[model samples]
Target: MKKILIIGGVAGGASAAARARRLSETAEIIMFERGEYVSFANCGLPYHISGEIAQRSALVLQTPESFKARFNVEVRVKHEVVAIDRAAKLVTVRRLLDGSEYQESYDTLLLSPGAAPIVPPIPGVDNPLTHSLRNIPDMDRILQTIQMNNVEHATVVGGGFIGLEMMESLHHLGIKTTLLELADQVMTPVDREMAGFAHQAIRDQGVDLRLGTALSEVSYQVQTHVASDAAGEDTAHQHIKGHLSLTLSNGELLETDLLIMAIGVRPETQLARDAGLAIGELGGIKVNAMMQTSDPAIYAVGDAVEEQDFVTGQACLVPLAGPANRQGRMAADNMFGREERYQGTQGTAICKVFDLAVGATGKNEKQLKQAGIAFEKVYVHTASHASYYPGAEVVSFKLLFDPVKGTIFGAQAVGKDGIDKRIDVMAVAQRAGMTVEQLQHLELSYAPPYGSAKDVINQAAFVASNIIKGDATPIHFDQIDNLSEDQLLLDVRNPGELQNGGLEGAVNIPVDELRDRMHELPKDKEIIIFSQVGLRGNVAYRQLVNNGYRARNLIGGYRTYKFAS
Candidate 1:
């Protein structure tokens, strides 16, 4: 019988063990996890801390007992895998309970050790009150602290997924939250303009967002730093203890009740590295398409494995559960000679705030530019479902595609319900190597309460298609600041559109009246029209293009420009 051993069981390891048992009923599968629980949903940690998840047991998707009963797999929890002998195909495990050790032999081995939280060089970072959300234990600690201290305010230091999720959950619990992002934007996976919507959404939820900010360090002070109130005469809190003071990027100090350092995470590949497995340039276990590591008999998946970014062909260490789970299944199938390959991920991801949904998939403008890939980008803001439909939310979509073939390389969307639906469809389409033309013509389901004549994904495709076909040349909102004198900037919406919201330093010429006002437009300059959702701008482009005007339309219009403004 073939013996299969998996190190670290969670989304990736546990999944591999279960799938392996299913593939070969006679194969002995043993899974080892250093933590207490193997198959728990680590993604639910933030939700549990925020009180959205009522029970701690809910965080555990499945226990080792159930896994054993169903898959006939042996799961060992609280056991650490310390060493690996690639030549002998042996693994050394230390049992935490007995303080004893044992060696397990395997025909094939899988590594799914996942990732560790990134702790930057900051003083007093080891404070018991500060916490990170990577596992169940971390969640438990954060929750206990919140419930104990009645934490009214929290400062989340980072703008990544975990940071935003933590901020949203805390805000949901009525906790005044402060989010400090070192970069100009949050949700670094998505482009800044796309993240701009999430930035606004955070502000909508009353979160104190400090963008383009820095955290010098975290330290506890013993001296009672006295400060006067509006009177500025008497010392306030003279006898109270000094709390944690955070120095911001803009030379400001902020005091908070609690702190969450959701900076980022690094791959956990110590066992593989110690065993002399080839760690890639990205600091992950080197793996091929089938997830086979340098050792033929050993395989790695999840955060520990460095996979292709697909766009840049550069190795990316993305510690996300969605890709990890799928990679695990593929690795198991390949190990059994089932002939499966994990199609490289575009790193499609999604997150929900208090009421806003932020989603992104595939590559972005920066990745394309870095890879020196010739691509065109288009932005479009459309109703999430339909305009006439009640409770219809706005969805802003940004698409990047090959200019020559119109192939969609990546996409990002921000809005409420149906946001992920759009990004998910686009992600699948991009993965399938579909072009913008194919997406524009896709027959999407439509209804009054669901979508319009064109789905939001299709709308984005239409915008991209327009750019690909030269019907519209997209000028990104950021580039508006550097508009050359040779370019004519026009706002092609009604005067009322400006009354509501509009861009500055643009001639306001309504699309319907563009034909009559053509003589007034400068013929020597290349024209770019802006509008609310590109509706008027697109219409204006069609009219002016037929009339021999060198014109292009801003894909997402004024609203998108305003949000990204």
Candidate 2:
């Protein structure tokens, strides 16, 4: 019988064991996990704390006993694999219960050590009030700390997926929450303007969002309150210690009852390093197409492994459960002579912030720039459902594609509803290598209440097609900052729309009067046109392009520029 020893037991290890059993009925699969859970739905951890998931037991997808009974594998929880002997095909295991050590022999070994939360070396970070969430124990500790201390105010550092989720979760429990991000915007997977939609939604839910700021220091001190008797004599005093006082880079001091560090994670690669396995420059285990490490007999998967990106072919560390599970299965298949290879990851992800749902697939502007790939981006604001529907909501969708080929490289969407479906469709389209023209002809199911006749996906495709076809030139909202004094900023909206606000240096023409008043516009200077959303701006751009003028349309229009700025 083939002996398969798997390390770690969350998304990757558990998936590998299950897939291995199916591939070979008689394989001796032994799974070891340092944590108590073999298979748990970590995605539900935040929801559980918010009381959305009423029962905590529901997060445990499969217990060790269940795995043993079904897959006939020896599952050991709290048994950590400390070191690996690649040549001897042996792994040293340490038992957490009794501190006993033993060696297990395997014909093939699979490493799925996963990633660890990055805890920066900041002062007062060791206080009992500060914590990072990753597993069941972490969740329990946070819940218990909040209950024991009567946490009324919470601060979450970092504005990525976990940070935003924790902010929303704490808000749900009646805790006044503050979110701080070092970057200018949250959700780096989406461009700044698309993230602006998320920022608006987050602040609307009463979260104190601070951007471009970081924690300078965390000061903890003890406080004492003196008790006085009726005679004005000092009787006694109550002392409280270890209260955290946070100093931000922006020179503001804040006091929060609890602090959650959700900045990011690093691959847990100490064992692989000590065992002399090759590590990628990105600080993850280097694996090939078959998920094998330096030694063909030993393999690595999950967040700990550095895999090629599907779009850029560059090494990336995507610590997502979906990619981890898929990698685990591919590693197992290749182990059993199936020769299955991984196609890399596109970093697809989604998050729920109160009423809004934000989803994205593939690369963003940052990734594109880092990879040195030329791309074109366009933003389209379309109704999630038919406009005539009673409860239709506008979705802020953005698409990034190859400037020359017009093939989709990535996409992002934010809205109250139907954002998931739109992103999922685009994800499939990306996998199928669909171009902008092909996306326009996609025959998606449509109903008045469910979706529009021309779905948001279709509308986004049409806009991109127009840009690539040279019918329109879309300049992003941020590009206005680089404009010279010679370029004229023109607002094509009616006078009433500019009553509340107008661009600092812009002239209003109104699209209806643009054709008759063409002579008024300067021919020597460049023109930048905008509207409420980009529809009217496109019309003005087309009119000017045909009339011998250098013109460009503001991609998302005035509203996008205002919110994004």
Candidate 3:
């Protein structure tokens, strides 16, 4: 019988064991996880802080008893694989419970040891009140702190997924929360303009958010320090003594009872490196399309393995649960000679900030520029469904595509509804090698409550098709700041829009009356037009260009320009 051994058992490792068992009923599969639990919903860890997931048991998707009964697989928890003997095809396992050691032989091995929470080397980070949510234990500690409520203030450092999720949950529980982000933008995957909505939503929801900030270090409080001069290993009493001290990069001292450092995480690569596996420049186990490491007999997946970028063909690391689960299944199939290949990662991601849903697929403007690829970008502001329908909400959408061939490079959208629906469509279309022009031909389902006759997908395509075909020349909102003195910025909305405030140097010329007032515009200067949401701006562009005036339409109109500004 073939002995298939897997190191680490969670999304990737646990999934591999199940698939291996199904592929070969006679294969002896043994899975080892250094932690207490074998299979869990690590992604749902944050929701538990607010009791959104009510039962703590729901986070544990599977257990050793369940795996053994269903798959005939042996799951050993708290068994750490300390070393890999590649030549001998054995692993030195340490029973963490008693610190005992043993060797396990295998015909083929899989490494899914995932990533570790990035805890910076600073003081007070070891305190019981300060935590980083990665596993069940991390979540348990955070919940205990909140329930204890020796006080009710928390400061979360970093604005990544974990940071944002935890911050929202903390605020939901009535804790005065402060969110600190090193970057001006919270979700770096999306552009700054798109992230602006989240910034407003966070602050609107009463989160004390500080942008362009960094955490210098953390230490014990003054009274606690002087008293502990009277107090780790004493976690139960730490909270009772007082709060902890956090020092920011700007030299501001913050006092908080609970602190969560969600800066980021690094791949756990110690075992792979010691075993002579080829590591990628991105600091992950380098594998080919088959997910086979330097040693063909050994395979790796999940956050620990580096993947190729679907759009740029560059090496990248994406430690998402979605890919981890899928990669695990693919690796098991390939190991059994199924010859399956992992079609690169598109970096598709989504997150909910307060009431808004923010998501993106494929590449963004920044990634395309870095790869030196020629691309054109377009923006559209439209309602998620038919405007006449009840509860219709607006969705701001962005699209990027090859200017020449019209191939899609990426997309981003943020709104209260229909965000996932739009992003999912683009992600699939990009994977299928569909071009921007083809998006107009897609027959998406439509209804009054669901979508418009021309869905947001088709609307974005129509705008992109016009720009690439030279039907409309667009100057993006970001370019408005550097407009030359010879250029004229014109507002094409009704003069009543002045109630919303107009651009400082812009002149108002409503599109309805542009024909009669065309002579008023300077003949020698180029006219840049903007309407409420760019649709009317397109109308003004055609009128100005046809009447012998040089013209360009603002990509997303005054609405997008205002948000981005």
Count steric clashes of candidate 3. Answer: 1
lDDT of each: 0.82, 0.88, 0.88
Model 1, C-alpha of 522: deviation from truth (Å): 4.4
Candidate 2 lDDT over 1-565, as tens digits, reads 8899999998998999999999999899999999888799988898899999999999998988899899988999999998998888899999999999999999999999898899887777877788899988999989987886567888999999999999999999999999999999998888787888888988998899999999989876654553457758664322232356899997899988789999999999999999899999999999999999988899899999997988878898889999999889988898898888898888889999889888899999888987788999888888888998788998888899987798889999898888999889989999888898899999988889898889888878888899888888888888876779779999999999998676877889999999999899999988999998898999999899899999999987877787787
If ranked by TM-score, best first, what sequence of candidates would result?
Answer: 3, 2, 1
Q: Which candidate number would show the highest TM-score if scored against the true structure?
A: 3
Give RMSD to native, each candidate. 3.8, 2.9, 3.5
Estimate the TM-score of every prediction: 0.93, 0.94, 0.95
Return the clash pairs for model 1, or none. 531-558
lDDT of 3: 0.88
Candidate 3 lDDT by residue in tens digits, 1-565: 7889999899888989999999989999999999999888898888877888898888888899999999998999999999999999999999999999999999999999998888787765887678898999888888887777454789998898899999999988888899999898898888888888889999998898999988888886533442233242434334464577788879998888888989888889999999999999988999999999999999899999999999888899888988999999988998898888999999899998989988998888888887789999888889999999898888999898998899888999999999999999999999999999899898988899999999988988988998888888889888876789889999899999978966777899999998998899988999988888899999989988888888999988887888885
- Judged by lDDT against the true structure, how good is candidate 2? 0.88
Model 3 regions lying over 4 Å from their true place: 222-241
